[PDB]
Structure 1
C-alpha cells in the first residue's frame, strides 16, 4: 500500500529519489565511480600505442585463437586489450603504432566469445582498417 493522501508529495518524492539508486543504470551512470575507472573517461575513441600482440582463445563452445593487441593509451596512460577485427588485419600492424580504439558495442560489458576484451581497433597510423583491408589505401 502506498502513501496516497493529498499533502504527501514530500514523502513520495523523497522516496522515489532514494529508490532510484537501486536502479542499476541510474547508479552506474550518476554516481561517478564508473567514469574514473573506465579507461576512456567517457570518450568515443582513444588514441594509444601498441605494446604487444596477443592471441586469446574463445570461450568454451567456440574453438579459435582470436587475434588481439595490447594498447597503452596516450590520454591517461592506462593499458587496455583491443581486438583487431577483420580477417588478416593483424598483419597490417607494426608495434609502437598509433591506433584509434573504439568500444566493442555493448557499453562497458565485455562479451562476444572473447573473455575480458571490450575494445576494438578502427585505425592504424591514421589509415582505417577498412581501407587497408579492401585494397583501397596502403601503409
Structure 2
C-alpha cells in the first residue's frame, strides 16, 4: 500500500513526479524531443512552398488516391506531406506556391486511411482553399 504518515509529503510528491513520466502526454509535453521532432515547432500553422504534387494510396479496406502535396516549410526548411481536403482543389494547386498548412486533426497523428500524413493545406497563394472551392473568389490570374 501507499504511505500515509503525517510527514511523508516529501515521499508522496517525489514519487508522484517520478511516476508522472510514465504517461505519454506528460512525457511528450515536458521532454522537448517531441517539440524538436515536430515539423511545425509548436505552431498551429506553417507556410511552405509546394515542392511537388503526389498521390497517396489508401489503407487496405479502402481503395483511393489521396491527392497530397510535398511542401517545404519556409522556416526550418523541413519537407512534409500535406493533404488537399476537397474534391478538385488539387487543380487549384500548381507548382511553387505559398500554402498555409495546418495539422490534420489529432496532434501529429495520421488521420483516416491516409498513411503517414498529418497535415492538410488551408490556403494557397494567400487565398483560402474554401473560398476557391465555393467560388467566392478566384485565382490571382
CA deviation map 1:76-102 (0-9, x unaligned): 100000001100000011100000000
The TM-score with structure 1 as length reference comes to 0.98
Q: In the comparison of the two structures, how many residue pairs are matched?
A: 139
Cα shift at 1:7: 0.9
Distance 1:82 1:18 in 2: 38
RMSD between superposed Cα atoms in Å: 0.7
Distance 2:125 2:33 in 1: 32
Unaligned runs of at least 5 residues, structure 1: none
Distance 2:2 2:94 in 1: 64
Runs of 4+ in 1 over 2 A off after TM superposition: none
The TM-score with structure 2 as length reference comes to 0.97
SS in structure 2 at match of 1:99: strand
SS in structure 1 at match of 2:19: coil
Cα shift at 1:111: 2.3
Cα shift at 1:118: 0.5
Cα shift at 1:128: 0.5
